[PDB]
Design a protein around this ligand. Structure first.
Ligand SMILES: CCCC(=O)SCCNC(=O)CCNC(=O)[C@H](O)C(C)(C)COP(=O)(O)OP(=O)(O)OC[C@H]1O[C@@H](n2cnc3c(N)ncnc32)[C@H](O)[C@@H]1OP(=O)(O)O
Ligand SMILES: CCCC(=O)SCCNC(=O)CCNC(=O)[C@H](O)C(C)(C)COP(=O)(O)OP(=O)(O)OC[C@H]1O[C@@H](n2cnc3c(N)ncnc32)[C@H](O)[C@@H]1OP(=O)(O)O
Lengths: 865, 118, 153, 157
């Protein structure tokens, strides 16, 4: 019923309300299983607000058959009471109906229940509703919670024989501990304090907003319950589109068949104009857009027929690449269907690249220019990565940086002497702790320059890191002004500059919260909290016209690496993407504002479904975005990055990996991907060498330049295998959409651990077949090698540098530190914009300070099992 | 069977998301008659030790699959001795990330046992 | 080239034959009937060749064959199920409604194992032997005999 | 039984270079793939060091693995007619077929194959197309990765 969850939240209220002045002892009891003899004291794992010197917790097993408490509870309590605590909190195991053993050993009793208690008459059986000083109907977000409150409140009124009182006055509270800063929990807390206070307890006047009421307002829900089945709605949207394709196709076919037979009669002499009467009916039956499609088809054929794409300013584009033999290879090959039913069917299901539903690509033709060389750098401190950046980006006009952070920064922590942290600093990513570190990282680079974009993969601490990056880009122009004019900008001049920076700054935060819990298990904030701040960022972008920066990159790569098969990966990722869409909509934002700024990220493996993954993702998106959300062309175009599978790369026979990475790169390029990353052959063993990264880069260069079939930009189209697989995969995804929808959407499914569960299942099914020999892996479980079966990355000085730069930063802002951190917390309590405060917070606070502040206010991820 | 009631604190090391294995160990411990205070994943030494000391356990089981295990256990052994918990036995099972020279080192430091894949 | 010109001609004949009988059925559903349409369709029946006519005749029966999970005497697996649960057909047939396209496809690129054997000379790829055949030969007969065993290990 | 043309495809050694030999497996893979896609009757795969020596023991395994990976691991290969239907395939099939027919005609109007060999027509045309390949490879018009572009800074030989 959320015993421990609610308890933890209640302790947090105590800490926030009394400024950690209270010494609270927590005695937990869980049932011990009589057969095993053991016990799972799993209450401490849920406790996030106990990590403090003033808090003490001791977990106990019942060690008794029919008891919900330990038979040694009174002594243990007496010990805590003698230890001069301010308050002792005791909790039991799972109560039945008649069970009520906690009542005599405590001063106040709190019955915790869920809206599911059965028929109302059941409440007349629960002994605890007769003794409890307070009743908390937890999980108040479930169905029938409101009626559950009425029923319980009436029952407690009846048990107390207080018919001179109002049922709404009864100590029955509707709480939702699962959600941060729940007003419901606070309302219960306000009640408990008054009760404890009158029962001899010294308490300072509360700092928490004294909220009145009994039920949670259900505030800070990300996806409203009305939009619960959004994934199912999308499934119906796509399927409806296809049923129309079938219907309109038959209409187009019959219309052609009639007028064809009509012309054949006039050539034979005897006529029957009753045929035309039927054909005229088909003209109106065919839709407006469907009719225009077939109308433009002969004109469309003439366009792609020539050697140039002629389309009062003109823009010519080459259509043909002539081979070494003299053969002309068309970039886009159109079908040669005589049937107008097939033509329409093809134009609606798989139009040419650059036309709805953009199945064969979102753009008309591939970019003739050289591929955007992603220059990714990140290791050691900001100084080393900044050097690395400058050395790779020497003499190039396309400053396209991709930053990688160390595990310390990825978890929002500051570097520290602590052995569990110190070793991690600088290793596997750049160490960025303060705004100063961020400025050093991108020194020299003009962030506001139109030809400079900065990518950086960060998830949990993403809003804070983004705030640093924004302040860096702003300070770069404030510096450039004080240098060009020799004088500091005035108040009006600075604000004019600052506003300009926000608009024109380019870059992307590769942030995806929904991937974190599903595949990775790397969350530092609660999923609900991150989504709220995520929305806060997207709201901030709207207000300041930030149209050149991307705040969301929806990944499914980590999900795939965890073992998820292509269908699961694609379905979950799209589902997550649609969740972000639904979330931004509920905040009251327009679809054409955030949809064009949604990047995707998939993994390409060896499975057949991977060949048609990108095209399916494009159609499912394009159709729903136009039909369900009614967005413009720029929003219906799903753009994605494909990275070859590392799950398919093995340490056994690493020379074979280039073969696999080639095949995966090929179908990615075939299916007109927007961005491709190729893995080295020794990524399964060591750090990618400069030679190994060339073999990886050569795979793309060979396919794009040497490979003949790749000269054609839509080679997939037409294939009976491709179209069938496209249909199959699409449907499988839709069915998965439905399964998630009937679990409360993506968020609701994550409460059950449905994604993480399914992934772990499919992972084991892969391992089972791999080990069984069923699923053959060359060099691993077959064709094995006869001959035989088979660093630091951060300077000590660099670690000391980060430590010194940190404590230097901390001393330089000692005065404004606590003031800013308190302001940040209050912005969460008052449900204001979190990112808006971070824009000021990062200038006087470190990453760790900000993260732990958000921990105190309650935004910390709570573990579960 | 066991003489006393054996209590354990189980957890995965800091920044270690992989708790797939430690959730198996806490089930076998549970089935053999042990009271397990499971802490889950991503646990700092300062957390695990505080839990062990408050719960007053006989043993601690830590899984580490992200590396950095040597400095981690050394910290825990140190922190346990400092705050009156040297008789609490620390155990290691990070699969095969720990090579024999590191197993021998840590066991010599103060770690009770570190179980090799052998 | 003559074969191709026939493909074009026979295709148009098959298309018109279908178009007429299609329009003829649509008139009977409306009420008024014109049997003059059937007169034109009957002319197409004779115009279509003997082998061409049998091709379109076997097409629905051909679809049912490759539809199942076995190719039924003897049997042969048609489907390999993926790791995701998707069924991958060995031979994927077209979904053309136009009988002109069906005939055109059956004459220019029939399924593997049927004339003109464009997609292969055999019905299905053999389970026993891969197409793999590796070039070998070094030193005397004794040494190559060992290399032969190494490749076919 | 006579209408069924059976053939063996061997990957091109002309496309295998001594400059950056590790790249050759990439080319040999792509060539092996379309060979298997198009339902070949027999396939030989070349070693990555074909331009230097006869296939070594380790290098003949990498060659053999290309076929094993495609036939066993590669998903699209599970389908035995993946080429069929493709607008590119059918058009290219038509184009190539016609080009061959026209070449048939040029040889026929030289007295057949034997008659053309009297003029050295085959050997002549071959030598021509060979130089056209070299005229573009050397020039940079026809890009070869590791050879006339993306050359290795560190690797002198
Ligand atoms: O590089 P970039 O992503 O910054 O380019 C941005 C703008 O270029 C366009 N673009 C990128 N690839 C294209 C293609 N293959 N064909 C036609 N247009 C293309 C793209 O539309 C984008 O413009 P916009 O910002 O979306 O309005
Ligand atoms: C610089 C120097 C380079 C060089 O000179 S390298 C040149 C070396 N030569 C080679 O690598 C290849 C040599 N040629 C051959 O192996 C063969 O000619 C050929 C046709 C390519 C392959 O023959 P095989 O693989 O043995 O099979 P096959 O076509 O002869 O037929 C064998 C009989 O077995 C049956 N069979 C085999 N596969 C089948 C299937 N998938 N479906 C149905 N039946 C099948 C079938 O009965 C067939 O006989 P038949 O068709 O009934 O007459």
């Amino acid at each position: 019923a959320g015993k421990s969850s609610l308890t933890d939240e209640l302790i947090r209220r105590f800490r926030l309300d009394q400024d950690d002045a209270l010494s609270i002892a927590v005695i937990s009891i869980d049932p011990s299983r009589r057969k095993s003899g053991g016990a799972l004291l799993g209450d401490r794992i849920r406790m996030n607000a106990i990590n403090h010197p003033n808090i003490f917790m001791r977990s106990l097993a019942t060690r008794e058959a029919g008891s919900e408490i330990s038979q040694a509870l009174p002594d243990v309590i007496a010990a805590c009471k003698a230890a001069r605590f301010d308050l002792v909190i005791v909790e039991t195991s799972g109560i039945g109906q008649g069970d009520a053993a906690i009542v005599p050993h405590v001063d106040l009793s709190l019955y915790v229940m869920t809206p599911e208690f059965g028929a109302a008459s059941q409440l007349e059986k629960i002994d605890m509703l007769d003794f409890a000083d307070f009743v908390a109907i937890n999980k108040f977000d479930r169905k029938g919670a409101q009626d559950a409150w009425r029923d319980v409140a009436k029952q407690v009124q009846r048990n107390r024989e207080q018919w001179h009182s109002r049922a709404e006055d009864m100590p029955v509270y509707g709480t939702q501990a699962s959600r941060f800063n729940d007003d419901g929990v606070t309302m219960l807390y306000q009640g408990l304090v008054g009760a404890l206070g009158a029962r001899g307890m010294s308490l300072k006047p509360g700092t928490l907003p004294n909220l009145e009421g009994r039920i949670s307002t259900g505030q800070n829900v990300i996806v409203p319950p009305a939009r619960s089945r959004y994934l199912a709605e999308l499934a119906d949207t796509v399927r409806a589109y296809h049923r129309r394709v079938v219907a309109q196709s038959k209409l187009a076919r019959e219309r052609q068949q009639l007028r064809a037979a009509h012309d054949m009669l006039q050539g034979a002499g005897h006529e029957s104009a009753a045929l035309e009467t039927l054909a005229s009916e088909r003209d109106v039956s065919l839709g407006a857009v469907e009719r225009k499609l077939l109308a433009m088809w002969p004109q469309m054929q003439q366009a792609y027929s020539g050697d140039e794409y002629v389309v009062d300013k003109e823009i010519r584009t080459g259509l043909i690449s002539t081979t070494l033999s003299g053969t002309k290879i068309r970039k886009v090959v159109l079908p040669r269907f005589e049937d107008e039913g097939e033509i329409l069917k093809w134009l609606m299901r798989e139009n040419v690249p650059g036309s709805f539903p953009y199945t064969a690509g979102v753009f008309a033709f591939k970019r003739e220019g050289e591929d955007p060389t992603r220059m990714f750098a990140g290791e050691g401190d900001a100084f080393r990565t900044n050097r690395r950046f400058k050395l790779v980006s020497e003499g190039m006009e396309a400053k396209r940086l991709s930053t990688a952070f160390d595990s310390v920064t990825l978890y929002g922590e500051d570097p520290h002497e602590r052995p569990d942290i110190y070793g991690k600093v600088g290793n596997s990513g750049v160490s960025i702790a303060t705004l100063e570190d961020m400025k050093v990282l991108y020194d020299g680079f003009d962030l506001t320059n139109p030809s400079t974009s900065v990518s950086m993969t960060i998830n949990g601490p993403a809003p804070t890191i983004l705030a640093m990056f924004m302040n860096t880009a702003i300070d770069q122009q404030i510096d450039r002004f004080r240098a060009d004019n020799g004088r500091d900008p005035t108040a009006d001049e600075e604000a004019k500059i600052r506003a300009w920076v926000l608009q024109n700054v380019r870059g992307t935060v590769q942030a995806d919260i929904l991937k974190e819990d599903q595949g990775q298990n790397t969350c530092i904030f609660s999923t609900e909290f991150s989504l709220k701040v995520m929305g806060d960022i997207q709201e901030y972008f709207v207000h300041h016209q930030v149209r050149n920066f991307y705040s969301v990159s929806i990944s499914g790569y980590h999900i795939a690496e965890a073992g998820a098969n292509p269908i699961s990966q694609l379905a979950f990722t799209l589902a997550n993407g649609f969740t972000y869409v639904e979330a931004y909509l509920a905040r009251g934002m327009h679809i054409d504002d955030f949809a064009p700024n949604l990047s995707f990220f998939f993994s390409n493996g060896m499975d057949p479904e991977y060949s048609v993954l990108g095209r399916v993702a494009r159609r499912i998106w394009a159709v729903t975005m136009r039909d369900k959300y009614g967005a413009n062309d720029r929003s219906q175009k799903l753009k994605y990055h494909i990275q070859t599978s590392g799950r398919s790369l093995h340490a056994q026979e690493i020379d074979f990996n280039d073969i696999r990475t080639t095949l995966q790169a090929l179908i990615a390029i075939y299916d007109n991907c927007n961005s491709l990353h190729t893995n080295a052959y020794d990524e399964a063993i060591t750090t990618p060498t400069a030679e190994s990264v060339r073999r990886a880069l050569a795979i793309q260069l060979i396919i794009n330049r040497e490979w003949g079939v790749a000269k054609c930009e839509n080679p997939n189209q037409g294939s009976f295998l491709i179209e069938e697989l496209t249909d199959l995969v699409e449907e499988a995804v839709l069915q998965e959409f439905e399964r998630i929808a009937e679990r409360g959407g993506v968020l609701g499914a994550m409460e059950t651990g449905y994604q993480r569960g399914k992934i772990q299942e499919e992972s084991l099914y892969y391992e089972q077949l791999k080990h069984d020999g069923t699923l053959p892996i060359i060099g691993v479980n077959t064709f094995r090698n006869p001959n035989g079966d088979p660093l630091a990355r951060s300077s000590e000085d660099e670690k000391q540098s980060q430590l010194h730069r940190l404590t230097e930063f901390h001393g330089a802002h000692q005065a404004d530190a606590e003031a800013m951190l308190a302001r940040l917390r209050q912005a969460v309590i008052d449900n204001r914009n979190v990112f808006a405060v971070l824009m000021d917070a990062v200038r006087v606070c470190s990453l760790g300070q900000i993260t732990h502040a958000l921990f105190e206010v309650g935004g910390q991820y709570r573990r579960n099992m | 069977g066991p003489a006393n009631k054996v209590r354990f604190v189980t957890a995965a090391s800091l920044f270690d998301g992989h708790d797939a294995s430690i959730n198996i160990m806490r089930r076998i411990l549970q089935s053999q008659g042990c009271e397990v205070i499971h802490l889950g994943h991503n646990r700092s030494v300062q957390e695990v030790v505080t839990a062990a000391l408050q719960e007053d356990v006989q043993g601690i089981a830590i899984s580490s699959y992200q590396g950095g295990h040597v400095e981690y256990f050394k910290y825990m052994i140190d922190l346990l001795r400092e705050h009156g918990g040297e008789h609490i036995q620390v155990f290691g099972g990070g699969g095969g990330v720990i090579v024999p020279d590191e197993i021998r080192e840590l066991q010599a430091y103060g770690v009770a046992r570190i179980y090799s894949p052998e």
